[PDB]
Amino acid sequence: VSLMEKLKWKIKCIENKFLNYRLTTNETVVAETEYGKVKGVKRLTVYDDSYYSFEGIPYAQPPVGELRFKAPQRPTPWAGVRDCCNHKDKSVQVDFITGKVCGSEDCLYLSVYTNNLNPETKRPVLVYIHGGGFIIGENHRDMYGPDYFIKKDVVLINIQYRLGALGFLSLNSEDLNVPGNAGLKDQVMALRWIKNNCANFGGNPDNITVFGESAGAASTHYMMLTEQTRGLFHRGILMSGNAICPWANTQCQHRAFTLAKLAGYKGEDNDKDVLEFLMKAKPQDLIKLEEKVLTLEERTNKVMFPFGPTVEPYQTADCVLPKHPREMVKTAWGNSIPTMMGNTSYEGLFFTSILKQMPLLVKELETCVNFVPSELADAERTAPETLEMGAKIKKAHVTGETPTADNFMDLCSHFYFWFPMHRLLQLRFNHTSGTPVYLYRFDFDSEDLINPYRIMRSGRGVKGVSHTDELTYFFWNQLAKRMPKESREYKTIERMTGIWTQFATTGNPYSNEIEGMENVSWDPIEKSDEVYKCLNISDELKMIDVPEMGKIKQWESMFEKHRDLF
Ligand SMILES: *[B]([O])([O])C1=[C]C(Br)=C([C])[C]=[C]1
C-alpha cells in the first residue's frame, strides 16, 4: 500500500464526481423493465458525445441475510418507477489502493447505456463482465465508462456479480444449499434479465454479445460452457482468459473452515456449523481475511485465489458447473457461436508488482518445476519426470545462464494465458460444430493514456503491453483524458470499439471501414492449423503468425507422455 496514490487517487475522486456532475444533463428518461419502470439520464463524454444512462438496475434480490452464499433470486417488482440516475455500490472487496475494504453485499446491479433510446433498428447488445480475479471489480464508470462504445450505435450493458468468498464459498453438504459459484449464478441471472429486457432499450435480443477481460474472460467462457445460458447470446469475446486457465477455478470446499477459523470460529470442522458462523460474520471481516486463507503449499503450487469458480459437489436447480470446465467444453453450446479470443503482447508484465515484493520468485526458474501444470507434477515437485517437464519450460523462457525478472514475466504470459488458450482451442476443435474462432494480439503500447491497473502493477514507465493494458482503449476511466482526434491513442480507441462492434454485429471482426485494416485478411483458426494466425493490433493492424507459437509448442511437449491430460 502507498500513502501517495492514496491522496491523489482521493483527489481525482473529488474531480470524477464533479466531472460526473458537469457531464450530466437535466434530460431524464423512463424505460419499462420486466420488473417495472426505471428512470435514466442523458450524459456527456469528453468527446462531446451523449448517451442515455441507466445505472442501479437490480437483476437479483439483494443477497443479504439468509440469502448470503446463496444463488441469486429474482428480485421484487414495483408499481411506479425506480430511480436509476446513480450507480449502486460494488461487491465487497479489498481496495488495492488503500488496503481497506469497501463495497457492499447489496451489489447485484447492472448498468445500461445507449446513444439512442429509440433507434428504428434493433441494435446489437454488448454485455461486459469485468475481471479482477473474481475478488475485485465494479461496473462503475470511473473504471468502466461507456464513453467510447456509445460513439457506436449499440447498447452496452455492464454487470456486477458477487466477488470473493461472498461469491464463491462452496460447501460439500447438500443440506445447506451452498454448492458454490454464486457469483457465476449472478452472471446467469443477469444474462437472463438482459435477454428479456434489452428490447426495451433498443436492443436486439437475437443479437447479443458477451465479453470480458481476465476473470471477465473466464466468466464469459463459463457463460458459454454452462447449459444454463443456452441460446441467450450469439457471440463471445475472450479477452486474456478462459475457463481452463489455472487461475480460473479452484476446489475450495475445504477452505470455508479455514476462513471461519481466521475469523475466530470456535468448534470443529462441520459444514453446518462453519456456515452458521460465516452467515453471521461482518462482510468486511471475511473479505479482508481472505488474503490469509491459502496455505504456503497452495501458494507454492500457484493457487492464486482461495475462493473462485468451482466444480459443484452436487447438482441443483441453478448449478452452473457440474463437471470440470474441460469436460464441459465437450458439450458446450457456446462452442457453436462466433468466438473471438486474444491476449496482449507482454501479458506477464502484469506481475512486476508481485515480483518486486517477492524477488525470490525469480529463483523458481532455476528448474521451473513450480510452473509445471499441477495435474502433471508430483506433490513435492521433486520427481525426475517433474524436473524434466520443468526443463522444457526453462528452455522456452530462460535466455541466459541465470533467470531474470523478464524471463519470469514471459513465462507468466504462457502459464497464465497463452498455454491455456492453446489447450482450449485444441480441445474445442475436437468438439465443435465448426464455427470460426478469431485471434487478436493486442500490441499497442502507450503511456499517454492509461487506466488504474497500471498503478497497481506499477507499470508506470515500463515498456511493453501488460495484462489489462487494452482496457484503456475500450472504456473511460478517471485517469483518462480527451485525446487529439489524430493521436495514435484516439485511433486505437476507434479501431478497438470498431472491431468489437463489428464482431458483435456480424459475428465477423473484419470491416473495410476500420482505419488501418484495408489489406488485413482476418481468417479464423482451423483444426488443421499448425501455426496460429492473429490480427496483431499495433500502430499498424497486421495479420501475423502468433509469435508465441514456438513457446506454446514447447509447453505442449510436457504432455508428450500424458496426451490424455492435454
Ligand atoms: B485478471 O486481472 O482477472 C487476472 C489476474 C491475475 Br493476478 C491472474 C493470474 C490472471 C488474470
Ligand 1 centre to CA of 153 (Å) is: 31
Q: Which of 55, 347, 470, 548 is catalytic?
A: 347
The owner of cell 454485455 is: 127
* Bridge partner residues of 159 (DSSP): 110, 129
The answer to whether 162 touches 63, Cβ cutoff 8 Å, is: yes
CA 332 to chain centre: 19
Q: Please state, in angstroms and rounded to a whole number, the distance separating the CA atoms of residues 399 and 408.
A: 11
Which own/partner contact pairs does 540-544 have at CB distance under 8 Å and 24+ positions apart? 540/516, 541/495, 541/514, 541/516, 541/517, 544/441
- SS3 assignment, position 190: helix
* Bridge partner residues of 145 (DSSP): 476
Q: Please state, in angstroms and rounded to a whole number, the distance separating the CA atoms of residues 20 and 134.
A: 27
CA 533 to chain centre: 24
The owner of cell 482476418 is: 522
Residue 540 C-alpha cell reads as 499498424
Instruction: Give yes or no: 347 in active site.
Output: yes
Which of 357, 418, 368, 355 is CA-nearest to residue 397? 368
* Ligand 1 site-directed mutation target among 144, 163, 247, most atoms within 8 Å of CB: 247
Ligand 1 centre to CA of 133 (Å) is: 5
Ligand 1 centre to CA of 132 (Å) is: 6
Ligand 1 centre to CA of 85 (Å) is: 31
CA 241 to ligand 1: nearest atom: 11
The secondary structure of residue 515, as a DSSP letter, is T
* C-alpha Rg value of the chain to the nearest Å: 23
The answer to whether 195 touches 125, Cβ cutoff 8 Å, is: no
Ligand 1 centre to CA of 134 (Å) is: 9
CA 216 to ligand 1: nearest atom: 3
Region label for 181, one of left (φ > 0), alpha (ψ between -120 and 50) or beta (otherwise): left
Q: Any residues with CB less than 8 A from the CB of 50 and at least 6 apart, and which?
A: 25, 42, 43, 44, 115, 150
Rounded to 10°, the helix 271-280/255-262 angle is: 50
The owner of cell 463459463 is: 222
Indicate the pairing of strand 437-442 with strand 533-537: parallel
Instruction: Give yes or no: 414 in active site.
Output: no
Question: Going by CA atoms, what residue is nearest to atom 7 of ligand 1?
Answer: 133
Integer CA distances (angstroms), 295 to 290, 292, 501, in order:
12, 8, 43
- SS3 assignment, position 221: helix
The answer to whether 394 touches 416, Cβ cutoff 8 Å, is: no
Q: Any residues with CB less than 8 A from the CB of 446 and at least 6 apart, and which?
A: 488, 489, 492
The answer to whether 106 touches 64, Cβ cutoff 8 Å, is: yes
Q: Which of 467, 470, 494, 548 is catalytic?
A: 467
Which of 543, 441, 449 is CA-nearest to residue 493? 449
Burial 10-19 (b: 16+ CB within 10 A, else e): eeeeeebeee
| DSSP H or E stretch at residue 36 | strand 36-44
Ligand 1 centre to CA of 521 (Å) is: 31
Residue 63 C-alpha cell reads as 443477497
Instruction: Give yes or no: 111 in active site.
Output: no
- SS3 assignment, position 135: coil
Beta-sheet strands, E only, within 115-168: 123-129, 155-159
Residue 227 C-alpha cell reads as 447449459
CA 453 to ligand 1: nearest atom: 2
Q: Please state, in angstroms and rounded to a whole number, the distance separating the CA atoms of residues 528 and 551.
A: 19
Q: Any residues with CB less than 8 A from the CB of 213 and at least 6 apart, and which?
A: 130, 131, 239, 240, 241, 468, 470, 471
Question: Going by CA atoms, what residue is nearest to atom 2 of ligand 1?
Answer: 132
Ligand 1 centre to CA of 499 (Å) is: 24
The answer to whether 81 touches 54, Cβ cutoff 8 Å, is: no
Q: What is the largest CA-CA distance in the chain?
A: 71
Which of 243, 263, 61, 233 is CA-nearest to residue 162? 61
CA 134 to ligand 1: nearest atom: 3
Ligand 1 centre to CA of 75 (Å) is: 31
CA 351 to ligand 1: nearest atom: 7
Residues flanking ligand 1, CB < 6 Å:
131-133, 214-215, 241, 247, 304, 416, 468
The answer to whether 121 touches 111, Cβ cutoff 8 Å, is: no
* Ligand 1 site-directed mutation target among 161, 416, 418, 458, most atoms within 8 Å of CB: 416
CA 417 to ligand 1: nearest atom: 10
Integer CA distances (angstroms), 303 to 112, 287, 300, 373, in order:
35, 18, 7, 11
Q: Where are the alpha helices (DSSP H) in 269-320?
A: 271-280, 283-289, 296-300
Residue 553 C-alpha cell reads as 509448442
Q: For this experimental structure, what is the resolution in angstroms?
A: 1.9
Question: What is the CATH superfamily name and number for domain 1-566?
Answer: Alpha/Beta hydrolase fold, catalytic domain (3.40.50.1820)
φ and ψ at residue 330, rounded to 5 degrees: -60, -35
The owner of cell 448517451 is: 51
Beta-sheet strands, E only, within 370-507: 437-442
Ligand 1 centre to CA of 549 (Å) is: 22
Length of the chain: 566
* Bridge partner residues of 38 (DSSP): 31, 82
The answer to whether 73 touches 60, Cβ cutoff 8 Å, is: yes
The answer to whether 472 touches 493, Cβ cutoff 8 Å, is: no
Q: Please state, in angstroms and rounded to a whole number, the distance separating the CA atoms of residues 557 and 291.
A: 34
Region label for 150, one of left (φ > 0), alpha (ψ between -120 and 50) or beta (otherwise): alpha
The owner of cell 482468459 is: 241
CA 217 to ligand 1: nearest atom: 3
Which of 349, 350, 353, 348 is CA-nearest to residue 371? 348
Which of 194, 225, 189 is CA-nearest to residue 60? 189
Which amino acid does the sequence have at 138? E
Which of 178, 164, 329 is CA-nearest to residue 244? 329
The secondary structure of residue 213, as a DSSP letter, is E
Q: Tally the C-alpha atoms within 13 A of residue 358's C-alpha that lie toward its C-beta.
A: 8
Q: Please state, in angstroms and rounded to a whole number, the distance separating the CA atoms of residues 168 and 180.
A: 5
Question: Going by CA atoms, what residue is nearest to atom 6 of ligand 1?
Answer: 133
Region label for 507, one of left (φ > 0), alpha (ψ between -120 and 50) or beta (otherwise): left
The experimental method, as deposited, was X-ray
- SS3 assignment, position 374: coil
